[PDB]
Write a structure and sequence with these properties.
Helix 5 packs parallel to helix 7 (104-110). The chain has helices at 2-11, 15-23, 38-44, 48-56, 71-78, 81-89, 104-110, 114-122, 137-143, 147-154. It is mostly helical. It has 10 helices and no strands. The radius of gyration is 16 Å and the shape is elongated. It is classed as de novo protein. Keywords: alternative scaffold, DE novo protein. It forms a monomeric assembly. The entry is titled "crystal structure of anti-IL4 darpin 44C12V5".
């Protein structure tokens, strides 16, 4: 029961409740119906303090949901820069690949998040990684008309 409550508290940004639940033995790597962990939900919903506590309590930084996405994929998607930086510092795989062949750099390029692109590049993101349709992150940025990102990535092509 505590795993479900932890998923719910982490998603709802309930800092105090997350701490209470963990002190009561809640499984930090509990899964919901879609394969999300509390770290996935906190990362996606922009809950920085919870992301940090979950990691301290042994949340798997590279947990993959049903689609193969890590918390870093989700943070790069919604565009939470500080959460991306925290995930990276805690050992997130910068080049994690989901089922679609998509890396966090692909994600940031698609959603037009330039500052996240730059942080991912500094952390060693692979600019030559191709998704299942053969697209690099540069291809994606160009295709979706995000010119600032396309230009930075083209310096590495």
């Amino acid at each position: 029961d505590l795993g479900k409550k932890l998923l719910e508290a982490a998603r709802a940004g309930q800092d105090d409740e997350v701490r209470i639940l963990m002190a009561n033995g809640a499984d930090v790597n509990a899964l919901d119906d879609s394969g999300y962990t509390p770290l996935h939900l906190a990362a996606e919903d922009g809950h920085l303090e919870i992301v940090e506590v979950l990691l301290k309590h042994g949340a798997d930084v590279n947990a993959a949901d049903r689609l193969g996405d890590t918390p870093l994929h989700l943070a790069a998607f919604v565009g939470h820069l500080e959460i991306v930086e925290v995930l990276l510092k805690a050992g997130a795989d910068v080049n994690a690949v989901d089922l679609a062949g998509v890396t966090p750099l692909h994600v940031a390029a698609f959603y037009g998040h330039l500052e996240i692109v730059e942080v991912l590049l500094k952390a060693g993101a692979d600019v030559n990684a191709q998704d299942k349709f053969g697209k690099t992150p540069a291809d994606i940025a160009a295709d979706n008309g995000h010119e600032d990102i396309a230009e930075v990535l083209q310096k590495l092509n």
